[PDB]
Amino acid sequence: MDWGTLQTILGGVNKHSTSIGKIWLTVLFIFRIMILVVAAKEVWGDEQADFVCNTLQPGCKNVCYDHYFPISHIRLWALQLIFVSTPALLVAMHVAWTYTSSIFFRVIFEAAFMYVFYVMYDGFSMQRLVKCNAWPCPNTVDCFVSRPTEKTVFTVFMIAVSGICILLNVTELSYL
Amino acid sequence: MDWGTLQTILGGVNKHSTSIGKIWLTVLFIFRIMILVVAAKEVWGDEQADFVCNTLQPGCKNVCYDHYFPISHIRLWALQLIFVSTPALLVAMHVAWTYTSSIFFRVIFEAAFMYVFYVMYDGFSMQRLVKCNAWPCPNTVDCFVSRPTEKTVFTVFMIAVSGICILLNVTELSYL
Incomplete structure (x- = not known):
């Protein structure tokens, strides 16, 4: 891939005691893009062949995999970014009803992804072994995970970034 | 093995218009013993590793094996013989309440084994493929048999012998 190949005329800088945010926020935008693609298919890209289930039950890996991973972290992120992405191209150029409501949208989205995330991954963690007692999964069986530490780390990062x-x-929405 | 190694003094033969049966019946006794041991562990002796189940279900071979073969033919025979065996050593020597009741016992046993047999192996046959839909056997699965023709043949024999x-x-019980 390659994203962004024309940014040269940016001599105009800020002078007020504000608009520091837009610097920080474009930086976090670009950042999160890199941070994503660089580790995109490279932490959670694997986790299909990595959910070992101690059993001889057919399918129970798939069963428990969806059971505990309806969706992977990186998708909730990918979405979180994209919904939080549209205000970026908006704020690309501003001076001359929406504009500040773009800022507020950007807030409330990111908040939502935080909440629903912690609803799903309660404990801000990656359990080393999830058991499973699904229908085909005949009793409570064991179902492993790879690199739970890893995924936990990058999750801590992305949530801090969200904050x-x-x-x-x-802070710039609160100008009054 | 070896069974029977002392029979020399049998010069006395029958002269009446009866007791032909005891000849026929001792012959059938000895016969069925040979017939058994010669093919004893040699038709049904195998059928443990011979009940292939098209599946990947664990245990479903054992499950369906008991399901369709609670017991093998040769056991019902083995029993049929033994219950029908005790009157033989009785009638070994006779001339001088039981004696004819031994004959009747010998009748009714053999009858019973015939009936309960056909209850179990209905159709006097060996199906080339028995399906199976047991609990662990996840759907109706297939479960094979080896040498069904063979076993059918020797069953036809033993039942004719019973008759x-x-x-x-x-015919000798009916002397009046």
């Missing part, structure tokens, strides 16, 4: 994103997003 | 056994057994 700072919103804090400057809102 | 003639009883017919002479009773």
